[PDB]
Design an enzyme around this catalytic site. Structure first.
Site, PDB file in Angstrom:
ATOM      1  N   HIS A 137       6.921  -0.456   1.369  1.00  0.00           N
ATOM      2  CA  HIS A 137       5.909  -1.448   1.019  1.00  0.00           C
ATOM      3  C   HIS A 137       6.273  -2.165  -0.280  1.00  0.00           C
ATOM      4  CE1 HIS A 137       1.982  -3.281   0.437  1.00  0.00           C
ATOM      5  NE2 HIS A 137       1.814  -2.629  -0.700  1.00  0.00           N
ATOM      6  N   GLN A 190      -9.351  -5.933  12.304  1.00  0.00           N
ATOM      7  CA  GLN A 190      -8.313  -6.823  11.811  1.00  0.00           C
ATOM      8  C   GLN A 190      -8.784  -8.266  11.876  1.00  0.00           C
ATOM      9  OE1 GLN A 190      -4.979  -6.113  10.368  1.00  0.00           O
ATOM     10  NE2 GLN A 190      -6.532  -4.545   9.943  1.00  0.00           N
ATOM     11  N   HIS A 194       1.424   2.872   1.589  1.00  0.00           N
ATOM     12  CA  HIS A 194       1.691   2.498   0.198  1.00  0.00           C
ATOM     13  C   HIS A 194       2.871   3.282  -0.360  1.00  0.00           C
ATOM     14  CE1 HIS A 194      -2.636   1.337   0.691  1.00  0.00           C
ATOM     15  NE2 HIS A 194      -2.144   0.234   0.154  1.00  0.00           N
ATOM     16  N   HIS A 239       3.902  -2.291  -8.048  1.00  0.00           N
ATOM     17  CA  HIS A 239       2.456  -2.427  -7.875  1.00  0.00           C
ATOM     18  C   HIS A 239       1.679  -1.261  -7.263  1.00  0.00           C
ATOM     19  CE1 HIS A 239       3.137  -3.591  -3.674  1.00  0.00           C
ATOM     20  NE2 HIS A 239       1.831  -3.505  -3.499  1.00  0.00           N
ATOM     21  N   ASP A 240       2.349  -0.375  -6.530  1.00  0.00           N
ATOM     22  CA  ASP A 240       1.671   0.793  -5.948  1.00  0.00           C
ATOM     23  C   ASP A 240       2.387   2.077  -6.362  1.00  0.00           C
ATOM     24  OD1 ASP A 240      -0.658   0.120  -4.443  1.00  0.00           O
ATOM     25  OD2 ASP A 240       0.600  -0.845  -2.928  1.00  0.00           O
TER      26      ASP A 240
END
Ligand SMILES: Nc1ncnc2c1ncn2[C@@H]1O[C@@H]2COP(=O)(O)O[C@H]2[C@H]1O
Ligand SMILES: [Mg+2]
Length: 324
Positions: free
Chosen positions: A83, A280, A79, A117-118
């Site tokens: 990203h 995953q 993050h 966003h992060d």
């Protein structure tokens, strides 16, 4: 309170011009920004200019904003700044392929939302913050880190010479901050499940109406999820390398938990790496595939994202079979 970029940083970005070869490649959904690190800030300026116009934002303010945002992302494995630009590019591709469906205000708000966003993510999940009763968890009860990200975004705008939105009318200024707030909060995957369920019902029954604001908010929320998870829509090698970063960050959180007397879930336990392929597979079946399937139903031009996701699901199955 926020870190501020240096004059050298924002002034240098003002002189960046995207190479011609990249101008062509950047329009594709599978585009990977990975091999062009020095160009990341410039790539974002370019995308904003193409989607919103070269004069949408005062160049100086836009460059200060971008470089200060970069400076406020931390050195965590996943993050991070990379990203942020990766998620912003996916939004750029979605918006480009559905251009007139979204307003000018929504496009500028969403590209900025994705870049931020992060913002100031510390490498710890909401589950950690709430499980260890961290200060942030008391204030922001749910969507803890996401509410922090939005607060930090507003904080950067408040820096001198950084408010790219000040020229908007008071009404549109409030409107764009709301678009950004909802968009960033939407990246809390906990909210994705209910949002997708609602959208699937609206779509299947035919009640979905893009001219209905409550519906638009949900579609935008799904778009944010699709962008946040886009590493699963890249070519396999890129998808695999990003997965390594995702787990590196989660394993570090797991390590800290162990040190504090709390055993982490298998996903965050580096001593359980062998379970990653199945992990995953479960994620693609429970989150990724459904997400892009619904997105493609609502926005047909985004089909390439779904095709890529399905391809990577097949790749994980190959790993599980021993054909790695
Ligand atoms: N390949 C993946 N990409 C992104 N998120 C993933 C992936 N696999 C599992 N996840 C989970 O989905 C979440 C999406 O948002 P986060 O990045 O906050 O945290 C992520 C993980 O908890
Ligand atoms: Mg996040």
């Amino acid at each position: 309170h926020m870190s501020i970029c240096t004059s050298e940083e924002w002034q240098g970005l003002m002189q960046f011009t995207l190479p011609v070869r990249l101008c062509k490649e950047i329009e594709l959904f599978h585009f990977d920004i990975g091999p062009f690190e020095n160009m990341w800030p410039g790539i974002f300026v370019y995308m904003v200019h193409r989607s919103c116009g070269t004069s949408c934002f005062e160049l100086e303010k836009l460059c200060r904003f971008i470089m200060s945002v970069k400076k406020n992302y931390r050195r965590v494995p996943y993050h991070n700044w990379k990203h942020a630009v990766t998620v912003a590019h996916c939004m750029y591709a979605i918006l480009q392929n559905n251009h007139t469906l979204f307003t000018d205000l929504e496009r500028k708000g969403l590209l900025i939302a994705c870049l931020c966003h992060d913002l100031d993510h510390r490498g710890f999940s909401n589950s950690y913050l709430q499980k260890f009763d961290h200060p942030l968890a008391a204030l922001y009860s749910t969507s803890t880190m996401e509410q922090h990200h939005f607060s930090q975004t507003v904080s950067i705008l408040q820096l001198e010479g950084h408010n790219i939105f000040s020229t908007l009318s008071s009404s549109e200024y409030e409107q764009v901050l709301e678009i950004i707030r909802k968009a960033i909060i939407a990246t809390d995957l906990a909210l994705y499940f209910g949002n997708r369920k609602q959208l699937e019902e609206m779509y299947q029954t035919g009640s979905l109406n893009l001219n209905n604001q409550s519906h638009r908010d949900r579609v935008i929320g799904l778009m944010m999820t699709a962008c946040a998870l886009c590493s699963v829509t890249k070519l396999w090698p890129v998808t695999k390398l990003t997965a390594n970063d995702i787990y590196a960050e989660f394993w570090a959180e797991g390590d800290e938990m162990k040190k504090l007397g709390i055993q982490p879930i298998p996903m965050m336990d580096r001593d359980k790496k062998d379970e990653v392929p199945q992990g995953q597979l479960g994620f693609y079946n429970a989150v990724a595939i459904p997400c892009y399937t619904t997105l493609t139903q609502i926005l047909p031009p985004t089909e390439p994202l779904l095709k890529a996701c399905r391809d990577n699901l097949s790749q994980w199955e190959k790993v599980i079979r021993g054909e790695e």
